[PDB]
């Protein structure tokens, strides 16, 4: 028996932006969000509108709304979020 007591760890973060994807849920923009993967056919499957900020970053409306419920900055550039499309 060897009980670990601490795991002081080091990890390198790098930007993982891939083309035509939603950064919050790591899912495609046109496809539904990871919150709407459940009850896939219950709704109209159109309320997952593509929200574009003034910084030209495309997320899902549910994803960016859940992000803005806690943090008011865009995930991919740490700048304040401003809707300009839908």
């Amino acid at each position: 028996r060897f009980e670990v007591k601490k795991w002081n760890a080091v990890a390198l973060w790098a930007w993982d932006i891939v083309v035509d994807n939603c950064a919050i849920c790591r899912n495609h923009i046109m496809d539904l969000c990871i919150e709407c993967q459940a009850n896939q056919a219950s709704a109209t499957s159109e309320e997952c509108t593509v929200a574009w900020g003034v910084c030209n970053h495309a997320f899902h409306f549910h994803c960016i709304s859940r992000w803005l419920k806690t943090r008011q900055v865009c995930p991919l550039d740490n700048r304040e979020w401003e809707f300009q499309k839908y």
């Binding site: 007591k5 002081n8 390198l12 973060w13 790098a14 950064a23 995930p75």
Partner: protein
Amino acid sequence: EEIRCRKYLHPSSYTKVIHECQQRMVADHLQFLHAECHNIIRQEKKNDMANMYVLLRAVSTGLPHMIQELQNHIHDEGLRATSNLTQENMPTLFVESVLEVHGKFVQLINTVLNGDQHFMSALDKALTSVVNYREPKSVCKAPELLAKYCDNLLKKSAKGMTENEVEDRLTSFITVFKYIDDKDVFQKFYARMLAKRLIHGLSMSMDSEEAMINKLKQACGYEFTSKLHRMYTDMSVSADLNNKFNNFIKNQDTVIDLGISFQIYVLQAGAWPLTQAPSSTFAIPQELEKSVQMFELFYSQHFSGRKLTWLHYLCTGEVKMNYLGKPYVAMVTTYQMAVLLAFNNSETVSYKELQDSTQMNEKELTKTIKSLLDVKMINHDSEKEDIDAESSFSLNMNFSSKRTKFKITTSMQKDTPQEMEQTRSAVDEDRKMYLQAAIVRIMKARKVLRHNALIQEVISQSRARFNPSISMIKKCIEVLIDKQYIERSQASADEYSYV
């Protein structure tokens, strides 16, 4: 003569009379003074040096010989001072010797020389070649010595270093650092040492690190320290990031229960000099896999768009040896933690069993086993303690430490001379990209230039960072040839063409 031309003339002729009196005693006999300037400088006679400066300042070609003689004297004095240095304390002694020479000569210039821009520039030009002593068929040891000096004084030590003493030492250190002329090498070496100091907690105070980075930024700009400040910020933020992670796990639907502890040090990728190049396809143990998964979930939810490259050679956990009648708790890297948790399965273990469980490379596994047997935490059944095809490793229950918490890892030092070679290689690579940028910019702006002017402008432009070499410039030209961004003129090979 000044008095008797003041009292016996017109104010318009004050400057012509003294000009004629000078260029009859101190410009006609210029050789008589230039043959004794060398003596009075290399012997440092105060009154004679002051008088000769006063005499030769007014004459046109009076100072340049004296300036050159003082520069040669400072060059020889600096070379004599930084010649026979004890390797035990060479990084400190070299910088202190250059500081002593600089202070003595700047006081000599500022007191008996009516301190001049030309003479102090001569002191700077002499000390630049004093510090950059390229030994025959050797690389410049000055940037490594300076980086090691900063590392030695900024690290936690029991020698005794008050904060004020460190602050003034680093304030005076910049007067040596500004002469270094190899700032790519010093930047890479200081980043390499600062990474270890920040990660392993060797820094005496992060206020000191911020102050040193500020000093280097003042000395060179916000592109020398553009990545050192990111390295410092990523460690000043990690406390708040870990607080956010603890809030995340304590604000979940269920009980998360990581189980052990977690002190993650998430770092930038482009800022830190660290890399996953020495990868071994390490298999994270079961007791850490849950915590890795939970932090991956947290970081994918709270910092979107970022991927983590978990560095395992810098992870340093703590393991309790309650199996072997616990004498202490070992501060052990996760590489050796994996093989110790494989030892947890059974008293005996084989090299192939370790390769199957931890999935590490042969060299990393060999290094971990060697580090464990050097501490004699485990023992080898075979007489040959080195690894073999099977090499059945056993568990040494007889070994017990004399402390209640002993650290078995040593990664804070030994400096890995292979990493020094890699650092110099990365320095050369960045130099090559800089030279390529300069060459492409010049050959696009001008479209017609020869070898001599191009080399001179490259040396003039790139001198602020390093000293360029003709071989490196030719290598960059050949690389651009391979990338079809440059050619040479058909009329003359001296000129160059462009796409």
